């Protein structure tokens, strides 16, 4: 039983030591620095970003006619993989069908998309040019053809933001004259831990900020070598009237931990690369769903909610 007396929890001191800065934010990508947070909370934020927060995806697929080349289960799978733009909290969860299975759809739970394309021959083509985009009409079954079908109330629920596919240019299948695809996909809410197609954010991960410090200042042509080792920008050759050339670490955030120097025979004395233990550099690139701001906010929201859940179910006992 030994506590070290400096590990005391204190919300004021923690909140004061914590610092956040947002390097860049776009409609898709977001890169920002958290600091003053122990590793496990960073692991938790990453996990909730990838796994735990919900987002609609195509679960069921009812094919009415499919004579295409693509296997039917493959086509259902690949349709399921496409992403859909709808704020996943506008819906409820799907109560999964135990025995007594049929009557398990409602307008708040699931949304339906439908497509159908029959590739018919295009006769205007002069010669043989198997594009095939020009030889045949409706040749490539795109994603953008998955045209949503409103189910009752929904037509006015999402009138401001139509429930559409995220990327109208994804390829779903390919056809030639004669065959047809016709199906409707039932989309429900999902939790990424069960299947990957639910996970809103594609790529969310962090780096511990590297630290480069020069023990002994290098000189001359070695300054060129040292600038050359790390990628551009992070190593400047100082304009010093004393002597001729040195090198100092401008801004390491761009650098990768690549550890190229330590292989050199002469440099190994002069530089170490360490890691600021409480500076965390998140990067989050969305897929098609939501502004990454809402992603991170809702992620810490989800942690709060799961903690509330365990708190209450404990309070029962």
């Amino acid at each position: 039983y030994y506590f070290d007396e400096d590990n005391i929890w204190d919300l004021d001191k923690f909140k004061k030591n914590l610092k956040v800065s947002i390097t860049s934010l776009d409609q898709e990508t977001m890169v920002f620095e958290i600091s003053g947070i122990d590793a496990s909370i960073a692991n938790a934020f990453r996990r909730i970003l990838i796994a735990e927060i919900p987002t609609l995806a195509f679960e069921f697929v009812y094919i009415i006619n499919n004579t295409s080349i693509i296997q039917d289960e493959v086509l259902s799978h690949r349709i399921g993989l496409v992403p859909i733009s709808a704020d996943p909290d506008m819906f409820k969860w799907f109560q999964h069908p135990l025995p007594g299975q049929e009557a398990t759809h409602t307008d708040y739970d699931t949304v339906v998309f439908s497509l159908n394309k029959k590739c018919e021959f295009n006769k205007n083509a002069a010669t043989d040019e198997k594009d095939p985009k020009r030889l045949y009409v409706n040749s490539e079954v795109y994603s953008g053809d998955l045209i949503w079908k409103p189910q009752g109330r929904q037509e006015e629920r999402f009138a401001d933001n139509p429930i559409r596919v995220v990327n109208p240019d994804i390829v779903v299948a390919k056809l030639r004259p004669g065959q047809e695809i016709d199906l409707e996909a039932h989309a429900i809410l999902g939790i990424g831990q069960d299947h990957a197609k639910f996970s809103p954010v594609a790529t969310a991960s962090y780096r511990l900020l590297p630290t480069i410090h020069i023990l002994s200042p290098i000189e001359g042509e070695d300054a060129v070598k040292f600038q050359k080792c790390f990628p551009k920008g992070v190593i400047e050759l100082e304009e010093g009237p004393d002597g001729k050339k040195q090198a100092r670490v401008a801004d390491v955030r761009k650098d990768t931990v690549s550890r190229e120097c330590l292989r050199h025979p002469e440099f190994a004395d002069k530089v170490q690369l360490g890691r600021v233990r409480d500076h965390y550099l998140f990067s989050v690139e969305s897929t098609g769903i939501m502004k990454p701001d809402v992603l991170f906010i809702k992620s810490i929201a989800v942690l709060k909610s799961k903690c509330l859940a365990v708190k209450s179910s404990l309070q029962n006992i």
Binding site: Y2, F3, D4, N7
Partner: protein
């Protein structure tokens, strides 16, 4: 066919044993508690109410348990109801010289259940007798081994 033990821990477990028993490894409170608990896993195996630990090998200015201290902690928390502590001295596999000319690891020596000196390897626990796991099988009986 002979007496030597045929079971044992294997590849990842043994080289990570050489990395945990090594004296260069230090753990704080959080990692030590977590690791000891992951090693024991009481409830599913059972038999115990509350786990008992050892004091930290080095204490000031930061409390840092050492690895051999953790192997000793395990050896303790599997101690039978009332059986006197283990003691053993036997040669390890990794010869000491790899560590240092005249390094002391060499041969695992632990009295009263505490890895005083000597890192664990194939010989200490594996397909080699007169190590840890074999003497534990002798003293404490097989259902403990």
């Amino acid at each position: 066919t002979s007496g030597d033990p045929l079971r044992g821990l294997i590849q990842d477990h043994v080289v990570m044993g050489v990395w945990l028993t090594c004296k260069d490894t230090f753990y704080t409170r959080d990692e030590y508690q977590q690791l000891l608990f992951q090693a024991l896993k009481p409830d599913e195996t059972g038999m115990y109410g509350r786990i008992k630990t050892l004091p930290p090998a080095i204490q000031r200015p930061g409390i840092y348990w050492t690895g051999k201290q953790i192997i000793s902690s395990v050896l303790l928390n599997l101690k039978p109801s009332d059986r006197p502590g283990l003691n053993l001295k036997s040669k390890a596999k990794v010869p000491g010289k790899y560590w240092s000319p005249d390094s002391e690891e060499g041969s695992v020596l632990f009295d009263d259940g505490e890895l005083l000196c000597g890192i664990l390897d194939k010989s200490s626990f594996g397909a080699s007798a007169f190590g840890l796991v074999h003497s534990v099988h002798e003293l404490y009986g097989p259902d403990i081994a």
